[PDB]
Symmetry: C2
């Protein structure tokens, strides 16, 4: 049980994190049973079934194609479909050519043609473009060509083999797509939105908590995690955005995400958020440092830093709220202009030379924090306007 | 041609970048032909071949298993093997149970058992551990179980189906592994080393070029790229290290990488390098800023910054050189101790209060750069000792 206790604790962890994993776990079985039921009771027309494997290949297709998102299954399905089709055309042709050649030189030319096309496709699988969109496609290309040709089958049982494999791929993939679209869908574009909104939320949290904390047993450790991992989640979430983007470019236009939709913008805004998290990471590194500033000097500058920090955090919150609800807004304008005014005020206060009573090491630490905050304000401005452009160029809801 | 000109330019780009992609492109075809040649001319013993698909499944295995690295193919091959074996045991058993049940309630219990095991395995495919090591394994588990059972085959043609699919998977995978190991190998551990060494190299370059540049039409843009992307390559190279690590934990102990080898250390050193690149990124952001410091004040502090920058860069170069050749060294010691001395010297020079002639905005910029450099020195110390521990705990060549 002790290993079983371990596994059930981790299983229920993954469970309560997200129930859609459970619903999808059932969707797979539902699609499998649906397909096998189609092939047991022929609904209207019994096919050739010349080899007796139609059911085997339909189930192999369904297991291999079905993925989590809706775009993912749509992509694996479309790739598998078109790839098997074209590879079938070429396989039929090449085997006809081989029959044309001779009787003892048939296998040798079959070998030659398989070698050439397999080598060339494998080398195409190292491009960047194909690697991001259609690696499974080129895989099935190689697979199906060598499947059709190099099979030790007579010259007459190929005109049927291709149609068998092709029709099976079609019907299996279509079952997977329809189940995934119309049972309890899991769209990737929506997940990308909520991921973006989670990033913005976490940053706003840190900014407020910083405006509180920079001027103050095991609970220290709880708060340490409450600061560290909260933002660090943004730093290690670049491949996930990049993946949800590739999947989301396949989806069909559902409820609120119209057809021509700008995902590349979502990844660009991702990059900007990543830079803001770099800066925040430096700030946090100072919060948990060893050389520590006397509180009085930081209190000498509490005020403008307070405004800048709090107002940047409010602006991030406004962007998150306006995005997670796909609603259009303009509160970011005032909540960023206030921070600009606070920045110029801070510059003027620095012009007063009030810092002429401090040892320069403390000057190192304090001026570092000042610079980090200033850079964050500027980046928040750019993010604000970029997100504003994104929303406008996507037809968000101007109802407010 | 114009699209073809486009594609040939990109093809030759990917080509000249790395020729091992071409050699591997040929390795795939060589393995395919080898397998089909085995199944055409039975070398010693003709199998049952009761269904006429042994060649089809052998080629499907070879195309699907073969990957770039050596660890990758070894992993996909081992997963496919053990998974098909265990799934075969269960499929045989369950179909016997179904025969035990009845005659018209056979398909229903078959359905039930497939549903249960498929659903459970799909839900196991959401763990973290299984997701990093054996996702293909659980995939083939589901695949082969439903393949064996839900196939519309009589109760007597299963004792042969399992052995057919299993022996085919074995022989195909073994051909792929042997070709990939003994033709012109592409190890993943070696790639991880050279990736690490490339990271260290790029950082050293930036440090030297910074010690030159911080105190100075289209050529500005060439140098801008020569600074930006050089280090930015380290920032977006976390998933690649993480992937080469998973692949490298499968490889067999070849020439210089002994059996028990510490890859997790290579990823940890990766994380530390990533932090150093964060700092460097802030430095570069200041280099390309708009508000610009008058040169004279920076010249007031050129000297200790010069030593610190140059010596950290030299220390990084020493680590890279000692690692890329798997040779052991101790030049890092002196080349880091010199930087420590320079840091204390800089602190003392700051104690002279020489900075009492500067407007505090310039103080913001200058103290920011000072702090970045100091933090980089400290991180370089930690990286130095961590890499030193790594080398020692891996038995590097103490010949110098």
């Amino acid at each position: 049980m002790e290993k079983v206790r371990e596994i059930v604790r981790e299983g229920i962890r993954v469970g309560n994190e997200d129930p859609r994993r459970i619903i999808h776990a059932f969707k797979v079985g539902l699609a499998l049973v649906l397909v096998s039921s189609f092939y047991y009771y022929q609904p209207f027309g019994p096919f050739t079934d010349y080899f007796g494997i139609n059911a085997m290949w339909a189930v192999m297709t369904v297991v291999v194609v079905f993925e989590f998102s809706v775009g993912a299954t749509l992509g694996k399905g479309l790739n598998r479909g078109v790839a098997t089709l074209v590879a079938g055309g070429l396989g039929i042709g090449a085997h006809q050519l081989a029959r044309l050649s001779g009787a003892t030189v048939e296998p040798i030319l079959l070998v030659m043609l398989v070698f050439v096309q397999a080598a060339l496709s494998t080398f195409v699988r190292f491009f960047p473009w194909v690697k991001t969109k259609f690696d499974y496609g080129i895989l099935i290309f190689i697979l199906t060509f060598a499947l059709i040709s190099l099979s030790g089958f007579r010259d007459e049982e190929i005109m049927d083999l291709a149609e068998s494999r092709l029709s099976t791929v079609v019907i299996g993939g279509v079952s997977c797509i329809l189940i995934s679209i119309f049972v309890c869908p899991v769209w990737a574009g929506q997940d990308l939105h909520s991921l973006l909104a989670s990033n913005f939320d976490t940053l706003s949290h840190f900014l407020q908590d910083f405006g509180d904390e920079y001027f103050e047993d095991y609970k220290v450790v709880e708060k340490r995690k409450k600061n560290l991992e909260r933002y660090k989640s943004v730093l290690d979430s670049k491949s996930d955005e990049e993946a949800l983007a590739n999947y989301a470019e396949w989806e069909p236009p559902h409820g609120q995400f119209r057809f021509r939709h700008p995902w590349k913008q979502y990844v660009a805004v991702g990059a900007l958020l990543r830079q803001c998290a770099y800066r925040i990471d430096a700030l946090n590194s100072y919060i948990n440092s060893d050389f520590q500033i006397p509180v009085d000097i930081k209190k000498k500058l509490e005020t403008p830093l307070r405004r800048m920090s709090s107002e940047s955090g409010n602006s991030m919150k406004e962007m998150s709220i306006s995005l997670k609800q796909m609603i259009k807004s303009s509160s970011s304008d005032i909540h960023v202009s206030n921070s600009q005014a606070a920045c110029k005020s801070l510059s003027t206060l620095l012009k007063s030379g009030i810092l002429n009573d401090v040892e320069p090491l403390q000057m190192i630490s304090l001026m570092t924090t000042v610079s980090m905050l200033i850079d964050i304000v500027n980046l928040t401005e750019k993010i604000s306007e970029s997100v504003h452009e994104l929303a406008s160029a996507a037809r968000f809801k101007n109802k407010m």
